Symmetry: C3
Subunit: 227 residues, 3 copies
């Protein structure tokens, strides 16, 4: 199988570890043996002008996934939303309310449907590629999530010297390592079968970085970098 998946992840934290804004949206192409991605795109947001209550992330996600899909022609697109694998192009008010998701889950998706359902329908008529809301059960999504963490670290690397101090909240139970020329992100959950990512970047000088648990959010790590 060849799958394109997209996720938004990584957050700027204040000194009380409260999230300020999300950082990276990543679309990945995942192929056998489905442990990583060698082909991917990234779109950075502005964490300092980000609405956490708003759900722009998923609109960026589905767009970025399509952009990658039109180039690599995958079998399917995985969107990070656990709706039981329902096709976005089939998302109308009728089908949303019939899902066994929270009542709030239903509320949010009726508004997204105005743009995303026709968008998925046109793309399906073009390419025949479905865009399914599968969320947590999907490995390409989790791999995309790992890369979202890595690009958040890269974002921190590229932006540490203008802000002189950054706390980056990583996605769930993943760690990062920084080599001379690349960032390595790895899932901390061995049950996932060895999921990982790698992104080439120039690592700036005069910086020190640390990785430690978020004391307020168990199984979430914090990436801290200074000058």
């Amino acid at each position: 199988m060849r799958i394109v998946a997209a996720d938004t992840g990584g957050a700027v934290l204040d000194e009380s570890f409260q999230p300020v804004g999300l950082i990276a949206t990543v679309a990945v192409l995942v192929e056998k043996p489905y442990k990583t991605s060698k082909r991917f795109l990234v779109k950075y947001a502005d964490p300092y002008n980000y609405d956490l209550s708003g759900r722009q992330a998923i609109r960026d996600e589905i767009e970025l996934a399509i952009e990658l899909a039109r180039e690599v022609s995958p079998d399917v697109i995985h969107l990070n939303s656990t709706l039981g694998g329902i096709e976005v192009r089939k998302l109308d008010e009728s089908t949303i309310d019939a899902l066994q998701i929270s009542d709030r889950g239903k509320e949010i998706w009726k508004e997204l449907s105005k743009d995303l359902q026709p968008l998925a329908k046109k793309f399906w008529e073009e390419t025949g590629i479905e865009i399914i809301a599968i969320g947590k059960s999907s490995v390409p999504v989790r791999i995309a999530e790992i890369y979202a963490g890595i690009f958040s670290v890269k974002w921190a690397l590229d932006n540490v010297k203008e802000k002189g101090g950054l706390l980056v909240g990583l996605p769930r139970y993943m760690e990062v390592e920084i080599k001379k020329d690349k960032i390595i992100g790895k899932s901390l959950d061995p049950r996932e079968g060895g999921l990982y990512g790698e992104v080439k970047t120039e690592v700036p000088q005069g910086i020190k970085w640390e990785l430690y648990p978020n004391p307020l959010v168990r199984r979430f790590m914090v990436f801290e970098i200074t000058s």
Copy 2:
């Protein structure tokens, strides 16, 4: 403690990773230190004529567990169904409806009770051995689940040269290793305390096998073998 447990696990997958049928039903004897099983039985199903909608699996389980229990005389039998550790022989509609399980779970078990409750009551009157539905809380069940994976791999080993290619979906977060004369199964979850299994088999030559994450079901591995 000496516990007999039984589980059905392992599935033949198509190339879209959709399960076709279940493979192995295994009953195990588990003793201190409760990390493995050295005494076990296996019953193979036909994955290509298997009904996933049906619940024959649990009927195969309770049969095989009893068959093994009559040989090794355990303290108790663990059946793989999370009902809070209630004895099967005590299953009437009143207590089933009083279980904190889904409405679909209740419907299924009310129909299962017709055969399974007298079966458990008769077995208890003979041997004094209870049959409890404990499921996820039981370690012997997980050990049985691991062996279901091991015997599923063995099934693939024995049937690969007639089918020239097989995708076997293993039970949750377990891996297998293939040595010269045996298959070794290990839980990928270190939290379970080092649970494993081991089964002797003649390993066919001229085969290639690979283990990788199921892209559609996170934390589930896929065993693929070809000629």
Copy 3:
């Protein structure tokens, strides 16, 4: 951040692995990098005269946490109860019933509020330190849980030769190591980022100890010691 957290953990088990009573209540001070604690208190209960139905544990916890907090002046106190991080001092029946907790959870805390809510209000007016019910989401709480496991082993070490045999049920997925002069406790979940503890103690001789899974409670280990 400097956080004081408290948890009760560790249980004396009978030979059917059924818990008799809880052992150790521990309050810990946790600072960056939030992986362990170098400052902690322990209060022992009598497992053989313990009410498991009762909720003495949480009253011992909040008391012991305050005692330590009065000495080290932390930023906040973490109590082991998952109520979404709500301040205990604001817990009345009105806000309790508005919590997304079980019907049993509401009943228990409505009764606890009679004593604990004025206690939390009094402590907050004195020191300005909030006592929040964060529970499973807190890392300092988990560290306290690990030390509770360590002190349960210590309790067993100190009481083994008078009891001539002990089964100690540890907290979820943690292991212990016993050195010449200390007990080392480690989380078995790599997702938590390497949480651990250490307690110096005199180790009695002519004892043998073993660590293995509780066969009736998956992901819970058992500590057994004899003479």
